[PDB]
Structure formats: C-alpha cells, structure tokens
Design a protein around this ligand. Sequence first.
Ligand SMILES: N[C@H](Cc1ccccc1)C(=O)N1CCC[C@H]1C(=O)NCCc1c[nH]cn1
Ligand SMILES: *[C@@H]1O[C@H](CO)[C@@H](O)[C@H](O)[C@H]1NC(C)=O
Ligand code: NA
Ligand code: NA
Lengths: 28, 251, 11
Amino acid sequence: EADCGLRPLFEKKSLEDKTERELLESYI
Amino acid sequence: IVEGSDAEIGMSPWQVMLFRKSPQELLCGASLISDRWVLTAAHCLLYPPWDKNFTENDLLVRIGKHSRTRYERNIEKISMLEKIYIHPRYNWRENLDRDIALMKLKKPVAFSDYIHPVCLPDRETAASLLQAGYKGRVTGWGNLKETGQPSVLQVVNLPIVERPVCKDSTRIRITDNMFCAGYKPDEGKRGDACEGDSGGPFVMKSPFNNRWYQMGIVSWGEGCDRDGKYGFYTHVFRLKKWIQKVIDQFG
Amino acid sequence: DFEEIPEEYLQ
Ligand SMILES: N[C@H](Cc1ccccc1)C(=O)N1CCC[C@H]1C(=O)NCCc1c[nH]cn1
Ligand SMILES: *[C@@H]1O[C@H](CO)[C@@H](O)[C@H](O)[C@H]1NC(C)=O
Ligand code: NA
Ligand code: NA
C-alpha cells in the first residue's frame, strides 16, 4: 500500500533501530 | 535463526506466524504485504517428501507477534485463511525453484503499531539493492541451532553473496529465482536461518526512500550456519509478475 | 509448548 515499509515505531517517528545502520553502511 | 538476537518491539511489524490448528504449533514464518494478503514459501504449505499438503482450514495466521509461545492479548491478531495460492511451477521435486505462495485472509487485518505491511520491490529497487555484499535482514521464530527454540522473535543481518560463490557451495542446482546470503568463513561473523524460519522475509531498507522492501523468502539451506554453506532465498522480484497476477484476479 | 489461543479462532 501507499504506506508500506514504514514502521509505526521507527520510521513513522524518525527513530532508528539498533542495527539498521549496518545495512546502510553495506549499500556502497 | 542461528546467531541472531532478540528483535526490538515493532521492528518487523510485517512478520507473520503460520500456525497449525491441531496440534497447535508453529509451522512457518510469512510476511504481511497488504491488509488481506500474506506471502510465504510454498514448501510451508506443500512438500510431498515430508507428507505436507495443508488446506486453508488447517491453518491460522498470527500477526503482530513478538513472543513465540505466548498469546499476546491486545497486540497480536489471529486470522483465518480464505485461499492458498501456490506458484504453478513450484519445483518441490528437485530444488525448491519458485518457492513462493500467497494466502488471502478471510477478513482484512487492522494495522497498528505492531502490524504493518512491507513493500514489494520494483525492478529498479531490486537492481539497485540485490548486489553482492549488500546486507538484508532475516527474522523468525525457528531453531536457534542446527542440532533450542527462542522465547521471542529473532533477527540477523546477512550479506548477499556473489552467484558463483553460491553455486560453488552446493551440489543443488541454483536458479535465477534464488539468491544466497550469509558470511564467508574468512569473514568471522556468523548467522543463518534454520528450520522453522521457512517462509519468513529477507528485507532491505532502501537508502533512496527509507522504506523496507521484501527482497527474499527463507527457502532452503544445507544445515544451519555451517561454514562454507549459505542460506537460499526466493527472489521475490523475479516472481512478482505472478504475485501481481494472483492479487489482480483474486483480490 | 504454546499457550492456548481463544476458542473463537478455532471454530
Ligand atoms: N535441508 C534442505 C535442503 C533442500 C533444498 C532443496 C530441496 C530439497 C532439500 C532444506 O533446506 N529444506 C528441505 C525442504 C524445506 C527446506 C528447509 O528446511 N528450509 C528452511 C530453511 C533452512 C533449513 N536449513 C537452513 N535453512
Ligand atoms: C495436495 O492436496 C490437494 C487437496 O488436498 C490435492 O488436490 C493435490 O493433488 C495435492 N497435491 C500433491 C502434490 O499431492
Ligand atoms: Na556447485
Ligand atoms: Na554459512
């Protein structure tokens, strides 16, 4: 849906989970 | 999940548990892709070598869960299945080629802080992110070791592996409808999916639009977290035309 | 192993 993939407790509040940065750092 | 960690609350709100009615037990993982559709591995529903061939009335879907065994009152939602759709060219005889299935729920599930759908990739997101070395995230309630079971949902981040390395790790025939992920022996870090994690999602967070996309489905592996072996995942984008055909004609 | 779920879902 239009809101897919945006988590209520994370992206929707601009909070990061404890390991998503590991994913971002691999996207090189 | 071997060598993972406990998920945070709400970390994977698209995570679905496939649950057998009788005996009451976990069958597989799955993912929520809309308010009425759940994506899983075909072998979660149909695997004749193990005498597995479930019908809709055999099963329930539990959404919004964190604890494996608790009934999470006021948080999880339990749904009955209207219909199962298995890919017509799913190859259970050889190598689990096209290991994908859809389940339509009898009624739409209400979204919440704990229940929310994942995106499916477009061609451009798939091309941009399905690259060797790029990491995704796998989640499930399956076994903690090859040879016990977790209290809460487990999560591990794993790198996509170059296709020649995947092919050279196994005698099973690999196809374009699969990719593999996991660390190499020389990399030190560990982690894998295991039995019970079948059907769960392999997700990546797009750095372009900051949305989570489901790129894979836990499909198969030889052992769990063995050195020199990798986990194999159904390539969701490669099978998206079938997903779209099912949803358009049965939605 | 699993906590019983409400009967409404099994009917
Ligand atoms: N060990 C088999 C290898 C195999 C592959 C293709 C065709 C037949 C058999 C195998 O993996 N299977 C058997 C059917 C279901 C599948 C399975 O358990 N998948 C769960 C994920 C997992 C298990 N281990 C590590 N990740
Ligand atoms: C699976 O079960 C359905 C109905 O129970 C049956 O029609 C179908 O032939 C079975 N498939 C296999 C591969 O045994
Ligand atoms: Na090989
Ligand atoms: Na390995």
